[PDB]
Amino acid sequence: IDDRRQSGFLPPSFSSTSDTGFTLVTPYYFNLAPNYDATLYPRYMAKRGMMLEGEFRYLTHSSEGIVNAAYLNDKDDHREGFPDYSKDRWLYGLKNTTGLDSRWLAEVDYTRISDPYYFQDLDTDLGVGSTTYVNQRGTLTYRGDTFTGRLNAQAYQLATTTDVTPYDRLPQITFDGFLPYNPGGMQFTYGTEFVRFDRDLDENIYFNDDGSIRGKRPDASLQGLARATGDRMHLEPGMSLPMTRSWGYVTPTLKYLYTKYDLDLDSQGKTDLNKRDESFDSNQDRSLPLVKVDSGLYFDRDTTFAGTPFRQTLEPRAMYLYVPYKDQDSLPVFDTSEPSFSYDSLWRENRFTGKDRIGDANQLSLGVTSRFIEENGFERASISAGQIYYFRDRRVQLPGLTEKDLKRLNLDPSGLDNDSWRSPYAFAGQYRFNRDWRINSDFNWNPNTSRTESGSAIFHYQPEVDPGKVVNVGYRYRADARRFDSSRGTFRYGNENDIIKQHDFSVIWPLVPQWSVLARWQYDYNKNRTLEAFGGFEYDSCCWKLRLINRYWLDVDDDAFLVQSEKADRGIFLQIVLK
Amino acid sequence: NTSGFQLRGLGDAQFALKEIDVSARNAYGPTVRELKETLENSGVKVTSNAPYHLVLVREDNQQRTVSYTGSARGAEFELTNTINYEIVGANDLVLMSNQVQVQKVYVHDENNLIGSDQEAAQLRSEMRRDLIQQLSMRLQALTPAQLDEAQR
Ligand SMILES: CCCCCCCCOCCOCCOCCOCCO
Ligand SMILES: CCCCCCCCOCCOCCOCCOCCO
Ligand SMILES: CCCCCCCCOCCOCCOCCOCCO
Ligand SMILES: CCCCCCCCOCCOCCOCCOCCO
Ligand SMILES: CCCCCCCCOCCOCCOCCOCCO
Ligand SMILES: CCCCCCCCOCCOCCOCCOCCO
Numbered sequence A: 001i002d003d004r005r006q007s008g009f010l011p012p013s014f015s016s017t018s019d020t021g022f023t024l025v026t027p028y029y030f031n032l033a034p035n036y037d038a039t040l041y042p043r044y045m046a047k048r049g050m051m052l053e054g055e056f057r058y059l060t061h062s063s064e065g066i067v068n069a070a071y072l073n074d075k076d077d078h079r080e081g082f083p084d085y086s087k088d089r090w091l092y093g094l095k096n097t098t099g100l101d102s103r104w105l106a107e108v109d110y111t112r113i114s115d116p117y118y119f120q121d122l123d124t125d126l127g128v129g130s131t132t133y134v135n136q137r138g139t140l141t142y143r144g145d146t147f148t149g150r151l152n153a154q155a156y157q158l159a160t161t162t163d164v165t166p167y168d169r170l171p172q173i174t175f176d177g178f179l180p181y182n183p184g185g186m187q188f189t190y191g192t193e194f195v196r197f198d199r200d201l202d203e204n205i206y207f208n209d210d211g212s213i214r215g216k217r218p219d220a221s222l223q224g225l226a227r228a229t230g231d232r233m234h235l236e237p238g239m240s241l242p243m244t245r246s247w248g249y250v251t252p253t254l255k256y257l258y259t260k261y262d263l264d265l266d267s268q269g270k271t272d273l274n275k276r277d278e279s280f281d282s283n284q285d286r287s288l289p290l291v292k293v294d295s296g297l298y299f300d301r302d303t304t305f306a307g308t309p310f311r312q313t314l315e316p317r318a319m320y321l322y323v324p325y326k327d328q329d330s331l332p333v334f335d336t337s338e339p340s341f342s343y344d345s346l347w348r349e350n351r352f353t354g355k356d357r358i359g360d361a362n363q364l365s366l367g368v369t370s371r372f373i374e375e376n377g378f379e380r381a382s383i384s385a386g387q388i389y390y391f392r393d394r395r396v397q398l399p400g401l402t403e404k405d406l407k408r409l410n411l412d413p414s415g416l417d418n419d420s421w422r423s424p425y426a427f428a429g430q431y432r433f434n435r436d437w438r439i440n441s442d443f444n445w446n447p448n449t450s451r452t453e454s455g456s457a458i459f460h461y462q463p464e465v466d467p468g469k470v471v472n473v474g475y476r477y478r479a480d481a482r483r484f485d486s487s488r489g490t491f492r493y494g495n496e497n498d499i500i501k502q503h504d505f506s507v508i509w510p511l512v513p514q515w516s517v518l519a520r521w522q523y524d525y526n527k528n529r530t531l532e533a534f535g536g537f538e539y540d541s542c543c544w545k546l547r548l549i550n551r552y553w554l555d556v557d558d559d560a561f562l563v564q565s566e567k568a569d570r571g572i573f574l575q576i577v578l579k
Numbered sequence B: 001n002t003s004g005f006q007l008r009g010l011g012d013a014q015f016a017l018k019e020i021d022v023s024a025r026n027a028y029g030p031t032v033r034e035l036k037e038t039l040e041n042s043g044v045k046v047t048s049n050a051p052y053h054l055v056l057v058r059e060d061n062q063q064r065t066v067s068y069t070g071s072a073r074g075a076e077f078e079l080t081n082t083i084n085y086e087i088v089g090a091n092d093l094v095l096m097s098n099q100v101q102v103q104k105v106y107v108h109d110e111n112n113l114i115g116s117d118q119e120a121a122q123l124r125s126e127m128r129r130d131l132i133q134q135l136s137m138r139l140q141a142l143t144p145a146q147l148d149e150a151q152r
Helices: A268-277 B030-042 B113-140
Strands: A013-016 A022-025 A028-030 A036-045 A051-060 A063-073 A088-098 A104-113 A133-142 A147-158 A168-178 A187-198 A213-215 A229-240 A248-264 A283-297 A302-305 A308-323 A361-374 A378-390 A425-433 A437-446 A451-461 A470-478 A482-484 A491-493 A500-510 A515-524 A529-540 A545-558 A564-577 B021-024 B053-068 B074-088 B094-107
Touching: A104 A147, A147 B113, A378 B113, A470 B053, A470 B074, A500 B053, B021 B030, B030 B053, B030 B113, B053 B113, B074 B113, B094 B113
Parallel strands: B021 B053
Antiparallel strands: A013 A022, A013 A564, A022 A036, A028 A036, A036 A051, A051 A063, A063 A088, A088 A104, A104 A133, A133 A147, A147 A168, A168 A187, A187 A229, A229 A248, A248 A283, A283 A308, A302 A308, A308 A361, A361 A378, A378 A425, A425 A437, A437 A451, A451 A470, A470 A500, A482 A491, A500 A515, A515 A529, A529 A545, A545 A564, B053 B074, B074 B094
């Protein structure tokens, strides 16, 4: 038949959203494709002008990449008063990756937009959510058999006006390698890093005509070391000796972390705020030992469910972690984040990410994992349960989450205990099946505050290789999120505004032959508000395919007063397809 | 003896196939390297000279938003790592083929992008080692008795 090469018009699509008005897209698929293709997306809009997109794709042995372009002359107006506003909307980016066969990997992830309101006005692909940033990174990586070196130049471009300016890692050089050894002898590892974090803060106030000022960018809410820039060097040598047996394993590991900071405080940060409170040191120094003992056992069993023979392995695991305490409050945060509690949290050398914060540790992590494997080697089910036992407290915290909250914030959020003697219970369950049955659950329960920190229950239903019947049911909860507060310039635990308790329903189901129903409903119980809800039909003829849906959804917005607002929209979407 | 559980003994983690040519679309990378490493530590030597090859084609790292903030912005991201492997035998014949995947969720901060990237990186490492674990479990159950039975 061939006919993969539709070098003509692709089945168009219509959209009447009563906000964007009438919108007709008529794609053209350039099939210059022995291995690489091209596509043109000329979108006509009613409220806005005629626009065009260009998507080039290439896929070969040792190479992969997608180039994107887009232009629109803005017919729609009255987003004028909004700052950083442009009438010539454009987008151009390159997502490249070359040299998968060689030791020289050249990755590229660049994307430049014209204005922060590009995705809030033109983007419909990512419907429910909308990206608040785009990647501007370029990575070169050498990868020897014994070591790995990487030069990375990564930055971010804000697709919004209500978030702080992201830091730049203009030259991040990492050298992580190991050392050749013989079975029974010691194993040596090393991780070196050098990053120059820089950032061009835009704290310039924006004006009106009579109202004078109407709002200032969030960057002007950063205080002191929050405005810090500069370089950081990290040296991390380590040694490990894994005694492995057929029934168990014990692995001692001793590492040493040395970090040095060459900072700059841009004056306004240090001359005003610092001097108003404390002193500033551009030359910073940190050196810690680290002890980690990882033990584990292996049990086996023979079961038979529904005639199918399964191997139920029981895997108990213990891990002691010791890191002495050092005051790190004088350090700024560049690449450090503190992930919420889970089962994986039990087996990490540091409760923080990045290198700006090294968690003071003296813990005994106890866990267990029972998994069911069918004799073709396939993992069908998995259950994990664990808890950490603290012998000391957790004094090293993010800016605003340490005893800063006691003084300069007078706050004490509910569910925050860093002085208790134990962690929440962590449960991670998973039940799978190849004909796309998939239920995944996660639950974290703090016994001290007697509160649920995190919850998750995801379910994906499919039948006997029939792609017509799909049923997705998801429930999510989150109240222990540690995020940077734009309005406070520091970190914050469990933001009342951003607490997650949402459900996501989805379904495609056959009614009568050639006909099927499509539906989805996302709902936030915290706001008691529906995020997204659409429903419609799919007529599957012998010749053509017609999909029609009525859709309601919330989109991100940042008004002229620079506050995060959510704004909804309802519309009809129609699409034709030949396959 | 009430349960039926008892410690694992050599005969279980014996690994039937003691040699196989492990290759990947990403010839030099963390996945394939740590894979060959784990296999060698398990007792299986890796060499290009082999009638049986384990080929990793198309390793995919996808990401989607799974929860939203109070301002309808991304709150939690779900990373899904998926590796498509095929076992090849004599004369470049695909003896068998399947996929192995895993997924995890992390909290994304719109005001701390680099920290979130670091968290995502660590998560990707853990997921990587999990996928390698699964591939190990799958390769252990293999037997040299399973032939090509090619027919055309
Ligand atoms: C791939 C490295 C890019 C990182 C440079 C830092 C960019 C951070 O600021 C982004 C916004 O500034 C506009 C960018 O300037 C023009 C970019 O186009 C030139 C191509 O390099
Ligand atoms: C002079 C070392 C500081 C305190 C003595 C501790 C003795 C054991 O620790 C030695 C590790 O000290 C870190 C050395 O600085 C990094 C150099 O090694 C990194 C390799 O690139
Ligand atoms: C086992 C729970 C308490 C252990 C905390 C370690 C510090 C106090 O113990 C010191 C005596 O133990 C001998 C070495 O301890 C382990 C190594 O880490 C301590 C650094 O000297
Ligand atoms: C004032 C009215 C209350 C606001 C709506 C809150 C409703 C939240 O609970 C709904 C639970 O009902 C589940 C029924 O499922 C029907 C949806 O499933 C169809 C899939 O699209
Ligand atoms: C859409 C699939 C069919 C399932 C029915 C769910 C309908 C939910 O979408 C309603 C969209 O309307 C938005 C208004 O949100 C509810 C407002 O009323 C609640 C009163 O507080
Ligand atoms: C211009 C659109 C105005 C209509 C308001 C949108 C209301 C939000 O609900 C959309 C989905 O609600 C169910 C409507 O279903 C469409 C018909 O298909 C029903 C079969 O499920």
